[PDB]
Design a protein around this ligand. Structure first.
Ligand code: FMN
Ligand code: 3X2
Ligand code: ORO
Length: 365
């Protein structure tokens, strides 16, 4: 809490004053991968443990995809106190992504806009990187610290479904869960994969590839969706997810909308907006998807989480787990312990025995 204030009031503002967002991100990835991190002294209580997706998670707060795109900082991220880590998005072939600058801070809105465009080291490099620590991950997982791998598609690929299938085959055996990302705002055509007939075709192929993996190397498969879907889109996704037995949903990616009230000078930059202005749009999408799937499909809630309250609202709305990313760029590593500490306090105040009891509680009021 002393370092929470120091990081929040002094350290982070100073690094932000010195470095553009992409440079700061690269540096943060480097520091994290080296273990150069403050004391994550928070000890996870049993209340925070969640069992879902065929796994135990010792706390429900994860790092969202996009921070460790290439699988370089996984262990440093667990050391930061995250109960699970998602790397990616990873595309089959290496690709540079969009021209710089492609990441923008909106300090007045506690928001970020990015158009990275799936910069990726590619499947082969990430595979070897994960292979080098595969058995350490197997122990982490057994210990309640699972690993997710988020799959993207190359900019120039003609068959999107084959890009994902390739990802399932190459990184599936190294992952506790896979994410089919059909919601990036920064790849042309990508989000139209969210439509019904095309999503059914895509996910059928994905699940078939997954089912062809040997039993101990067979990950759960989740779909990550946008916060900008029509009601029709959401109904169709819920329907396809139930028809195919998709294991879970990640809700949500960044928004292409610009909510009224944004103050940041850079608010009109092209890209996906994350952070505080996304928070409630995201929570509302979780609420809708939970109801449409009858509370039977696990949801990882993400978008604008920076406190225990933010996390609990998404849990009560139907999320079994939450992720954050943008909060980390403003508050630094201490925000992880902060969210966990506040979440636990709020669960007790509201009469929940643990996180599990709170999941979807709003729908039973
Ligand atoms: C700079 C940046 C890069 C991101 N890259 C990815 C990505 O590659 N794949 C993905 O599924 N989501 C990506 N995201 C989205 C996050 O995973 C998350 O869905 C979104 O930022 C909302 O969470 P937040 O408000 O806590 O940041 C990225 C977000 C940011 C800010
Ligand atoms: O600066 C931005 O606007 C930005 C934008 C997008 C993605 C990452 C960042 C930067 N994030 N900076 C981070 N710093 C840390 C950090 C800060 C202090 C000590 C150790 C670490 Cl790992 C974690 S994330
Ligand atoms: O690589 C990107 O730019 C990116 C991917 C994604 O899924 N979400 C996002 O906000 N940006």
């Amino acid at each position: 809490t002393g370092d929470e204030r120091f990081y929040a009031e002094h350290l982070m503002p100073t690094l932000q004053g010195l470095l553009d967002p992409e440079s700061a991100h690269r540096l943060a990835v480097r520091f994290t991968s080296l273990g150069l991190l403050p004391r994550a002294r928070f000890q996870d209580s049993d209340m925070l443990e969640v069992r879902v997706l065929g796994h135990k998670f010792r706390n429900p707060v994860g790092i969202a995809a996009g921070f460790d795109k290439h699988g370089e900082a996984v262990d440093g991220l667990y050391k930061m106190g995250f109960g699970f880590v998602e790397i990616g998005s990873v595309t089959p072939k290496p690709q540079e992504g969009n021209p710089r600058p492609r990441v923008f801070r909106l300090p007045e809105d506690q928001a970020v806009i990015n158009r990275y465009g799936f910069n990726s080291h590619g499947l082969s490099v990430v595979e070897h990187r994960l292979r080098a620590r595969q058995q350490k991950q197997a122990k982490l997982t057994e210990d309640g610290l699972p690993l997710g791998v988020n799959l993207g598609k190359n900019k120039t690929s003609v068959d999107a479904a084959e890009d994902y299938a390739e990802g399932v085959r190459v990184l599936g055996p190294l992952a506790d869960y896979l994410v089919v990302n059909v919601s990036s705002p920064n790849t042309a055509g990508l989000r139209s994969l969210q439509g019904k007939a095309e999503l059914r075709r895509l996910l059928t192929k994905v699940l078939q590839e997954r089912d062809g993996l040997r039993r101990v190397h067979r990950p759960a498969v989740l779909v990550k969706i946008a916060p900008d879907l029509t009601s029709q889109d959401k109904e169709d996704i819920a329907s396809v997810v139930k028809e195919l037995g998709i294991d879970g949903l990640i809700v949500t990616n960044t928004t292409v909308s610009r909510p009224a009230g944004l103050q940041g000078a850079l608010r009109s930059e092209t890209g996906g907006l994350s952070g505080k202005p996304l928070r409630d749009l995201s929570t509302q999408t979780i609420r809708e998807m939970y109801a449409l799937t009858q509370g039977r499909v696990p949801i990882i809630g993400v978008g604008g989480v920076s406190s225990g309250q933010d996390a609990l609202e998404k849990i009560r709305a139907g999320a079994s787990l939450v992720q954050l990313y943008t909060a980390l760029t403003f508050w630094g590593p201490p925000v992880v312990g902060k969210v966990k500490r506040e979440l636990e306090a709020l669960l007790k105040e509201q009469g929940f025995g643990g996180v599990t009891d709170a999941i979807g509680a709003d729908h039973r009021r």
